[PDB]
Amino acid sequence: SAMEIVYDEADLRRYFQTAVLLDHFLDDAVEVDVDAICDGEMVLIGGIMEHIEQAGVHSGDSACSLPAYTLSQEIQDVMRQQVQKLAFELQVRGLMNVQFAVKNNEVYLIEVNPRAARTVPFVSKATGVPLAKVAARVMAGKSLAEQGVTKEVIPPYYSVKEVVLPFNKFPGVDPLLGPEMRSTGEVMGVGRTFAEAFAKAQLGSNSTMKKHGRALLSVREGDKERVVDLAAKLLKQGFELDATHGTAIVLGEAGINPRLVNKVHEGRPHIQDRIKNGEYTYIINTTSGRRAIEDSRVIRRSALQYKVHYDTTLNGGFATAMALNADATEKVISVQEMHAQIK
Amino acid sequence: SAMEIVYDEADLRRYFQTAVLLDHFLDDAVEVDVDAICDGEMVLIGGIMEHIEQAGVHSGDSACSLPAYTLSQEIQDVMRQQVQKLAFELQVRGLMNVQFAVKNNEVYLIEVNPRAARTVPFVSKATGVPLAKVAARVMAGKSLAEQGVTKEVIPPYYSVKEVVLPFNKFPGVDPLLGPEMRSTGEVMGVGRTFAEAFAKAQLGSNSTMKKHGRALLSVREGDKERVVDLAAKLLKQGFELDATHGTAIVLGEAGINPRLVNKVHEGRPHIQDRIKNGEYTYIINTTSGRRAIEDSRVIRRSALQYKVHYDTTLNGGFATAMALNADATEKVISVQEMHAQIK
Ligand SMILES: Nc1ncnc2c1ncn2[C@@H]1O[C@H](COP(=O)(O)OP(=O)(O)O)[C@@H](O)[C@H]1O
Ligand SMILES: Nc1ncnc2c1ncn2[C@@H]1O[C@H](COP(=O)(O)OP(=O)(O)O)[C@@H](O)[C@H]1O
Ligand SMILES: NCCC[C@H](N)C(=O)O
Ligand SMILES: NCCC[C@H](N)C(=O)O
Ligand SMILES: [Cl-]
Ligand SMILES: [Cl-]
Ligand SMILES: [Cl-]
Ligand SMILES: [K+]
Numbered sequence: 001s002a003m004e005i006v007y008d009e010a011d012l013r014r015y016f017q018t019a020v021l022l023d024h025f026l027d028d029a030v031e032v033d034v035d036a037i038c039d040g041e042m043v044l045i046g047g048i049m050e051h052i053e054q055a056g057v058h059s060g061d062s063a064c065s066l067p068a069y070t071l072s073q074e075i076q077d078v079m080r081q082q083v084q085k086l087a088f089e090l091q092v093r094g095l096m097n098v099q100f101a102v103k104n105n106e107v108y109l110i111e112v113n114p115r116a117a118r119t120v121p122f123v124s125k126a127t128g129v130p131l132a133k134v135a136a137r138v139m140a141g142k143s144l145a146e147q148g149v150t151k152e153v154i155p156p157y158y159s160v161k162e163v164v165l166p167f168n169k170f171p172g173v174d175p176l177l178g179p180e181m182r183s184t185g186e187v188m189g190v191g192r193t194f195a196e197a198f199a200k201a202q203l204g205s206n207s208t209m210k211k212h213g214r215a216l217l218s219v220r221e222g223d224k225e226r227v228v229d230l231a232a233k234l235l236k237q238g239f240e241l242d243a244t245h246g247t248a249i250v251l252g253e254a255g256i257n258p259r260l261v262n263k264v265h266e267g268r269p270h271i272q273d274r275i276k277n278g279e280y281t282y283i284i285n286t287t288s289g290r291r292a293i294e295d296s297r298v299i300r301r302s303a304l305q306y307k308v309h310y311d312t313t314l315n316g317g318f319a320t321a322m323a324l325n326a327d328a329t330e331k332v333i334s335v336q337e338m339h340a341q342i343k
Numbered sequence: 344s345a346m347e348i349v350y351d352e353a354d355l356r357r358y359f360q361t362a363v364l365l366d367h368f369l370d371d372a373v374e375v376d377v378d379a380i381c382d383g384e385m386v387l388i389g390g391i392m393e394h395i396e397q398a399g400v401h402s403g404d405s406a407c408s409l410p411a412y413t414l415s416q417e418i419q420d421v422m423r424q425q426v427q428k429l430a431f432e433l434q435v436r437g438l439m440n441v442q443f444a445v446k447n448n449e450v451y452l453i454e455v456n457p458r459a460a461r462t463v464p465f466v467s468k469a470t471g472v473p474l475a476k477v478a479a480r481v482m483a484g485k486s487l488a489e490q491g492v493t494k495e496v497i498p499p500y501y502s503v504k505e506v507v508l509p510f511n512k513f514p515g516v517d518p519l520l521g522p523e524m525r526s527t528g529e530v531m532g533v534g535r536t537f538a539e540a541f542a543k544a545q546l547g548s549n550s551t552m553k554k555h556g557r558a559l560l561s562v563r564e565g566d567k568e569r570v571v572d573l574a575a576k577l578l579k580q581g582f583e584l585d586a587t588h589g590t591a592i593v594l595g596e597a598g599i600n601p602r603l604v605n606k607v608h609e610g611r612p613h614i615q616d617r618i619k620n621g622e623y624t625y626i627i628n629t630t631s632g633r634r635a636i637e638d639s640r641v642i643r644r645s646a647l648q649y650k651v652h653y654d655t656t657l658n659g660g661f662a663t664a665m666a667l668n669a670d671a672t673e674k675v676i677s678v679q680e681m682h683a684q685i686k
């Protein structure tokens with residue numbers, strides 16, 4: 001009345017110790033951000049952003065795309081409808097932001113921020129519409145209608161925003177994502193395709209990701225299934241794979257034989273070693289659970305330490321994969337050209 | 344003054360509880376049997392048989408070859424000489440049998456049986472010399488020279504002896520080889536090459552071995568080195584592989600990436616499951632240590648229950664591998680013919 005996610009009774013207390021609003025955690029859910037302007041008369045949708053990282057990974061630290069790269073129009077429209085309702089009910093006059101979660105083709109409302117959100121600039125840039133100015137006019141007494149800004153702009157190119165985290169400034173921290181924001185800045189990637197935009201945002205954020213080498217895959221239960229496909233993509237891109245017992249087990253059941261690696265406590269060599277010897281060019285590590293987390297800490301610290309690009313979400317992993325297809329230095333475009341393409 | 348191999352002090356005691364002579368166990372040594380006859384004037388080497396399974400697996404349960412398939416002539420000549428020395432010293436008059444163990448190019452005596460041994464019949468069949476008839480004559484007073492049997496016979500073909508175990512009659516028993524004899528009988532395989540004899544011997548032993556499929560590998564520490572080769576030989580022959588945790592680690596480091604399989608405690612699916620489901624056509628499982636044994640019991644028992652061919656020794660598995668290169672149904676030969684090839 002710090003945020004944590006508890007999985008069970010034990011966990012619950014367990015947290016209590018070290019310790020109030022309880023909410024059901026919408027697992028394996030897509031997170032969405034919407035910025036919109038309302039003038040009491042109507043509502044203009046500034047932008048619908050679909051996060052790369054799932055709900056549970058703070059929006060502030062999620063990568064995102066404008067326009068959505070996976071959500072259905074249908075569903076977006078739902079969200080678009082909801083905002084409007086919210087707008088009016090709350091009697092918004094100026095900017096507003098709404099965050100949703102999409103679970104099983106269902107739309108859940110996370111929060112409503114009836115002010116300017118840190119997303120505004122990215123949206124303005126992507127769409128060519130200075131939402132801030134507009135909403136400012138709106139607040140002063142000049143309607144959207146009167147402003148001649150009434151129709152929702154859908155760019156012809158992909159705009160992906162990625163973030164930068166201060167982890168390297170505090171080595172003692174576990175460089176891992178969560179419900180609480182820790183990033184200091186963001187970059188924007190502009191592309192013809194999501195993969196392209198993403199590759200640029202990724203490169204822009206200072207990533208050491210390579211297009212070749214050996215990948216380390218160590219994912220959680222709930223991801224043990226999808227990883228299969230990500231592993232495939234990596235193989236296709238020419239990566240050689242290593243895998244921790246559990247995950248290896250799963251891949252193999254699908255036709256994928258990675259090179260099994262040892263957790264720290266299981267033998268030498270182990271991960272830390274390999275990481276340390278620059279055996280990997282990529283690491284995909286997903287964890288769920290206070291302990292498992294604590295138990296996988298070393299993987300992340302080492303990786304951060306060794307300059308190995310790594311992802312801590314599967315959705316994050318896929319985007320990285322997809323981006324392997326694109327070439328961030330292939331084509332550059334200016335903000336001006338960008339806006340020029342808008343109809 | 345029921346035998347057992349103890350690895351350490353703890354073990355020692357450990358045994359002591361459950362339970363005397365004490366003999367250093369000659370690890371990774373080749374076991375050899377030698378059948379000879381002495382008439383007080385000379386000594387006749389009937390045959391030198393090299394065991395496939397190493398010392399520690401009772402000669403009565405080991406497969407063997409006449410002539411040896413790996414021992415050097417040098418070293419066989421050393422055994423030959425010791426046999427003669429022993430024959431004379433002990434005053435043998437008739438048949439005798441000598442058991443040696445070879446380690447690091449050194450011959451060790453395991454025991455002397457001053458009488459007809461169970462290998463006699465096989466040796467006679469393989470060499471065309473009826474040792475029992477000869478030794479009987481000697482015993483009755485007709486010397487080896489008088490008889491015209493004074494030169495060792497080394498047949499032009501390989502003769503392999505394989506055994507049959509009654510484990511299927513006692514499901515409650517762990518179908519594992521060791522220092523105590525459990526076999527009820529034996530067969531013989533005759534071939535142009537070791538591979539061919541072995542193959543015939545194995546088929547004859549009612550082995551369900553197949554020339555294709557998926558193999559399961561789960562070997563002890565010591566075997567971790569030679570396994571790679573086995574794994575490779577299996578790969579060449581067109582098999583697919585599965586392996587448990589440690590084995591997998593080793594294979595990975597060698598470049599072989601088998602499909603990982605779960606130890607029963609590890610989870611699902613595990614070995615029993617797979618064995619039970621017909622996933623395997625061959626199983627190679629080695630174990631050292633009373634406790635390590637008791638644990639792995641389940642692999643061995645399922646293998647047997649399900650009729651999957653299984654080897655419990657690395658030597659054995661190699662032999663099985665060699666046999667993949669042969670066709671036990673290709674050529675047959677009568678004993679008359681075999682004998683007729685002897686010069
Ligand atoms: N019920 C929930 N299910 C899933 N994720 C949630 C839930 N509540 C919050 N989150 C996640 O936590 C973040 C923080 O929640 P929010 O109410 O937006 O906090 P803040 O005021 O810090 O922005 C969101 O960006 C989202 O990823
Ligand atoms: N010191 C030893 N090192 C290795 N193997 C040995 C040793 N002593 C005996 N063995 C193993 O035990 C078996 C039985 O020993 P042996 O003295 O021949 O017993 P038995 O009287 O039953 O024939 C051998 O065939 C061999 O595999
Ligand atoms: N947008 C958050 C940064 C992603 C980071 N590579 C991670 O996967 O943890
Ligand atoms: N030579 C004795 C039989 C061998 C059996 N396949 C085993 O390896 O245990
Ligand atoms: Cl905000
Ligand atoms: Cl005997
Ligand atoms: Cl029984
Ligand atoms: K998110």
Ligand SMILES: [K+]
Nearest residue numbers: 111112113114
């Ligand atoms: K808030």
Ligand SMILES: [K+]
Nearest residue numbers: 374396397405
């Ligand atoms: K033996």
Ligand SMILES: [K+]
Nearest residue numbers: 442454455456
């Ligand atoms: K004996």
Ligand SMILES: [Mn+2]
Nearest residue numbers: 059099110111
């Ligand atoms: Mn929020």
Ligand SMILES: [Mn+2]
Nearest residue numbers: 402442453454
């Ligand atoms: Mn013996």
